[PDB]
């Protein structure tokens, strides 16, 4: 089984986060890093076998990604910390294998750090509430066009890592019930629940790729 | 029929990734909207995540570096469908050839080779053979083809170039008189093996020749 | 039918030249030896020597830098014939699209612009319009899209931001009161036109505004 | 009317630099590659330049001797040779591209040359010197260390005192002024030039030429008498 295992500092110091990989050959799969504060951001990724990286311009100067092949471990060093850096940091491995550009459905549980030119995705509404049986639909819009192959949705409940929900616009991820459905194209996409349920209350995030960087929406909180 | 040519990709690419290789197109796109996909090992079966295609544009993509010494070739298929999922072409076979880079150095089978020859022998007499291997491709390139030479001989008594070496076989031969056991009982030859048939990287080993009665 | 996709080439390439664009192939080459050729302007008619194809491999080549502002698009045909000269495919249409680079600076329609306005007018009042053109593409890129601004005003009496300029139209307007002919009869405004909609290169001209009674 | 004019002789001392000129007329200067070529007691391709953009290709061998420039305003190409030795003493030709039929151009337009006194596909030409009588068949041969497209294999004729003169192109096409007696053939790595019946006219040094990626190379020549 593919698993990523992740295990307090003062301003200006550096810290190294680890992501221990097992269940597959380490050298041949991209690992991505992601930041979260009370939305979600893509920091960058690395191909371990060749030590090749892609960075989001925004973290170019904070983050450095390395690997230790000998121990199947990816690292991210964060430099010169501020309060802004205090966040949850996830690692995630690629991806879904059907001939389209992979994404990353395998997340570590995240590590919590406390400190003493892209396709923007606007998600609405930020907070909504509904009752069971009711239809629920939510919306994501992008400053620029996105392939239907590279538009995805995640569900996150407090305390747990995000969880792939819909991929490539309309395919239901593994554990996901038929009530859910996604649709959309070009620059406008939506997620729909035929009949709301108690289970389904959570923060939902849209995700796109259309060249780097990966971006997320600000989230939709359902209650 | 016009097809996509085999796509030749050198192993150990630096990207940036994903890297555009070639663009599929069906001319039925002027009338209707067409959607592209790929199948085959590397795309939707192992190895995982090596290739992909952009659904709307048809651009075929490479997502990671390749290694010719692991896998030399891939065979994929490109497909074109309309919005309702109906096939509008016979699948297109797409070959990917991973071309060799010289990512291996030559290695002698042992660090010291020994041989022996009689003092009397005439020029042309074979003495011994040395060998080096190289894990690169030796058919389409020279990256795995080793050339041998004698860098030097010690001592230089009676003179230098007592011996020669065949640049492909590694066979060392005597090319002059006169050897005498009592005079010089042993020569030490520094031998070199150079890949790209003499144009590449070099490894060194020793060959000791004892002179006998 | 699967066809060879339009080939997009940015103008002003650095090569190396000749530059491989794309490889033609007929799948009848497993059986018979096939020979490729190209026709069309750029290849076997003017402009001279822009394109070629490698006869045996089918590689289509670009031999020189292109200029989008001279020629934006080429239409060629690929042909495949056996040794004895029999055609083995219908000709393949090959499109080349030359994509824009920002190789033109914005140019004002005149060196000095003049206009006037009455001393009394309210803020918001239009005074004059200035214009700069840019030969680059303004539809798919911003390379030919000009943004206007006022670098400075002389003299600064009664104060400094008497005027504004609409960043797309080039319309200059009054935004503050207290113009008086007797007091300051003439303002000199240094105006700027910057391509890439404000992110690119900047050209300067003058706009003189006379104050009237 | 495409013409390339070069001054003709220059005298220089060892270690200095010199700039050779090639004046162009009869066409738009900026749009056409200009090549430079060295000749001594055989022929060598130095490099070329596309004037409009000032882009160059160099033979690795002259990377450190030669730098190619242009002056657009005066339709003039220049080649600067640095730190001269006796080895540099030679004839230097400029030549414009090329033949226009959809295959990679060559360079059939030569200046008359300027005289200076102080990994590739190798082309082995044989025999170096041969003699024949009129009426006799004459054939000569060129072999290449590596494969060459039949589209990129050519032959030139040179008589003493004159610049080389395109003779056969793409293996078997006769250049403009060239008589039917001549015929070329060949494929892959072996090529030949043939004269059904020798003639007084035909006595000269013949050079094979290939391209298969840079650099252009030439054979050592065949001198016919
Ligand atoms: Ca390898
Ligand atoms: Ca290799
Ligand atoms: Ca090797
Ligand atoms: Ca051993
Ligand atoms: Ca023509
Ligand atoms: Ca231009
Ligand atoms: Ca332009
Ligand atoms: Ca511009």
- In chain D the domains, ranked by start, together with CATH numbers, are 1-119 (no CATH), 120-220 (2.60.40.10)
Which one of B101, B136, B169 terminates a domain? B101
CA distance D215 to chain C (A): 12
Same domain, C116 and C202: yes
Same domain, C158 and C71: no
Distance C10 CA to ligand 8 centre (A): 15
**Chain C contact probe: residue of B1, B2, B28 with most C CBs at under 10 A:** B2
Question: Does the distance separating the beta carbons of C49 and D102 come in below 8 Å?
Answer: no
CA gap C30, A20 in Å, rounded: 49
The count of other CB atoms within 10 Å of the CB of residue C152 is 11
Give the residue among B80, B71, B53 at the shortest CA–CA distance from B9.
Answer: B71
**What are the residues of chain D with a beta carbon less than 8 Å away from any beta carbon of chain C?**
31-33, 50, 52-53, 55, 57, 97-98, 100-105, 149-151
What is the number of alpha carbons within 13 Å of residue B34 lying toward its C-beta?
A: 22
Residue pair B194/B151 in contact (Cβ under 8 Å)? The answer is: no
Q: Which chains touch D (3 or more CB pairs under 8 A)?
A: C
Residue pair C66/C9 in contact (Cβ under 8 Å)? The answer is: yes
Q: Which chains touch A (3 or more CB pairs under 8 A)?
A: B
Question: Does the distance separating the beta carbons of C54 and D50 come in below 8 Å?
Answer: no
Q: Which chains touch B (3 or more CB pairs under 8 A)?
A: A, C
Question: Does the distance separating the beta carbons of B92 and C5 come in below 8 Å?
Answer: no
Task: Please give the C-alpha separations between residue C168 and each of B201, C104, C129, C133, in angstroms, as whole numbers.
Answer: 61, 18, 11, 12
Same domain, B112 and B213: yes
Q: Which own/partner pairs from D179-187 qualify as long-range (CB within 8 Å, at least 24 positions apart)?
A: D184/D155, D186/D142, D186/D150, D186/D153, D187/D150
CA gap A166, A173 in Å, rounded: 6
Residue pair D37/D30 in contact (Cβ under 8 Å)? The answer is: no
Residue pair C114/C208 in contact (Cβ under 8 Å)? The answer is: yes
**Assigned token pair, C19:** 């530059």
Ligand minimally distant from the alpha carbon of residue B103 = 2
Residue pair C116/C127 in contact (Cβ under 8 Å)? The answer is: yes
Same domain, C10 and C84: yes
Residue A214 has what DSSP assignment? P
Furthest C-alpha separation in chain D: 52
Starting at the edge strand found earlier in the chain, the sheet holding B186-194 runs B112-118, B202-212, B186-194, B147-154
Question: Does the distance separating the beta carbons of B51 and A99 come in below 8 Å?
Answer: yes
Residue C37, classed as helix, strand or coil, is strand
Question: Does the distance separating the beta carbons of A50 and B14 come in below 8 Å?
Answer: yes
User: Is D10 exposed, middle or buried, given 0-12, 13-18 or 19+ CB atoms closer than 10 A?
Assistant: middle
Domain that holds residue B202: 102-213
Distance D53 CA to ligand 8 centre (A): 18
Ligand minimally distant from the alpha carbon of residue B70 = 1
Give the residue among B111, B109, B37, B40 at the shortest CA–CA distance from B79.
Answer: B37
CA gap A153, A184 in Å, rounded: 12
Same domain, C115 and C207: yes
Residue pair A11/A115 in contact (Cβ under 8 Å)? The answer is: yes
Same domain, B181 and B140: yes
Resolution in A: 2.5
Same domain, B130 and B97: no
Question: Does the distance separating the beta carbons of C56 and D104 come in below 8 Å?
Answer: no
**Chain D contact probe: residue of C48, C51, C76 with most D CBs at under 10 A:** C48
Residue D9, classed as helix, strand or coil, is strand
Question: At D62, phi and psi to the nearest 5?
Answer: -110, 5
Residue pair C109/C132 in contact (Cβ under 8 Å)? The answer is: yes
Distance B127 CA to ligand 7 centre (A): 71
Name D219's Cβ contacts closer than 8 Å, sequence gap at least 6: D42, D123, D124, D125, D142, D207, D208, D209
CA gap D121, D141 in Å, rounded: 16
- Chains A/C: 3 or more C-beta pairs closer than 8 A? no
Ligand minimally distant from the alpha carbon of residue C70 = 6
**Chain D contact probe: residue of C41, C61, C63, C78 with most D CBs at under 10 A:** C63
Dihedral sign for Cα atoms in the order B28, B30, B34, B39: positive
Same domain, B8 and B19: yes
CA gap D129, A40 in Å, rounded: 79
Residue C4 has what DSSP assignment? P
CA distance B18 to chain C (A): 18
Give the residue among C117, C131, C111, C112 at the shortest CA–CA distance from C171.
Answer: C131
CA gap D200, D153 in Å, rounded: 26
Q: In terms of CA atoms, which chain D residue is nearest residue C65?
A: D53
State the total domains in chain C.
2
Question: Does the distance separating the beta carbons of B25 and C3 come in below 8 Å?
Answer: yes
Report the CATH number at residue C79: 2.60.40.60
Which one of C101, C123, C140 terminates a domain? C101
Task: Please give the C-alpha separations between residue A176 and each of B23, C33, D211, in angstroms, as whole numbers.
Answer: 35, 55, 62
CA gap C165, C194 in Å, rounded: 13
Question: Does the distance separating the beta carbons of C3 and B2 come in below 8 Å?
Answer: yes
Residues on chain B touching A95 (C-beta within 8 angstroms):
48-49
Distance B136 CA to ligand 2 centre (A): 4
Same domain, C116 and C165: yes
Residue pair D149/C37 in contact (Cβ under 8 Å)? The answer is: no
What is the number of alpha carbons within 13 Å of residue A11 lying toward its C-beta?
A: 4
CA gap D84, A99 in Å, rounded: 60
Same domain, B68 and B134: no
Same domain, B116 and B213: yes
Place of tokens 């420039």: D69
User: Is B12 exposed, middle or buried, given 0-12, 13-18 or 19+ CB atoms closer than 10 A?
Assistant: middle
Same domain, B15 and B107: no
Which one of C101, C119, C139 terminates a domain? C101
CA gap C82, C34 in Å, rounded: 5
**Assigned token pair, C174:** 């009054």
CA gap D107, D99 in Å, rounded: 7
């Amino acid at each position: 089984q593919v698993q990523l295992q992740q295990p307090l500092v003062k301003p200006g110091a550096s810290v190294k986060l680890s992501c221990k990989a097992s269940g597959y050959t380490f050298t041949r799969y991209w690992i991505n890093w992601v930041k979260q504060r009370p939305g979600l951001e893509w920091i960058g990724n690395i191909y371990p076998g060749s030590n090749i990286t892609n960075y989001n311009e925004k973290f170019k100067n904070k983050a450095t990604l390395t690997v230790d092949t000998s121990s199947n471990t990816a690292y991210m060093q964060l430099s010169s910390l501020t309060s802004d850096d205090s966040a949850v940091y996830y690692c995630a491995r690629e991806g879904i294998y059907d001939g389209y550009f992979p994404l990353f459905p395998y997340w570590g549980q995240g590590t919590l750090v406390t400190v003493s030119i892209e396709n923007v995705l606007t998600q609405s509404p930020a907070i909504m509430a509904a009752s069971p049986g009711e239809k629920v639909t939510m919306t994501c819009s992008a400053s620029s066009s996105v392939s239907s192959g590279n538009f995805h949705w995640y569900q996150q409940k407090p305390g747990t890592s995000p969880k792939l929900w819909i991929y490539r616009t309309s395919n239901l991820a593994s554990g996901v019930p038929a009530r859910f459905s996604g649709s959309g194209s070009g620059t406008s996409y939506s997620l729909t629940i035929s009949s709301m349920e108690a289970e389904d209350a959570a923060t939902y995030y849209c995700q796109q790729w259309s060249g780097y960087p990966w971006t997320f929406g600000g989230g939709t909180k359902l209650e | 029929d016009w097809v996509v040519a085999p796509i030749s990709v050198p192993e150990n690419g630096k990207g940036p990734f994903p890297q555009r290789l070639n663009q599929l197109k069906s001319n039925k796109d002027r009338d209707t909207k067409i959607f592209y996909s790929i199948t085959g090992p590397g795309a939707d079966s192992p190895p995982e995540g090596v290739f992909a295609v952009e659904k709307e544009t048809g651009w075929l993509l490479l997502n990671k570096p390749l290694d010719r010494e692991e896998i030399a070739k891939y065979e994929l298929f490109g497909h074109a469908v309309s919005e309702n999922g109906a096939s509008v072409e016979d699948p297109m076979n797409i070959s990917i050839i991973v071309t060799d880079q010289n990512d291996h150095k030559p290695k002698f089978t042992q660090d010291t080779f020994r041989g022996s020859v009689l003092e009397g022998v005439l020029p042309g007499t074979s003495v011994m053979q040395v060998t080096a291997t190289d894990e690169d491709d030796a058919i389409y390139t020279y990256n795995g083809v080793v050339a041998y030479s004698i860098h030097s001989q010690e001592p230089k008594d009676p003179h230098d170039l007592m011996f020669t070496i065949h640049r492909s076989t590694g066979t060392i031969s005597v090319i002059s008189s006169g050897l005498d056991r009592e005079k010089v009982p042993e020569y030490t030859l520094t031998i070199q093996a150079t890949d790209m048939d003499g144009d590449g990287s070099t490894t060194t080993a020793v060959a000791v020749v004892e002179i006998l009665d």
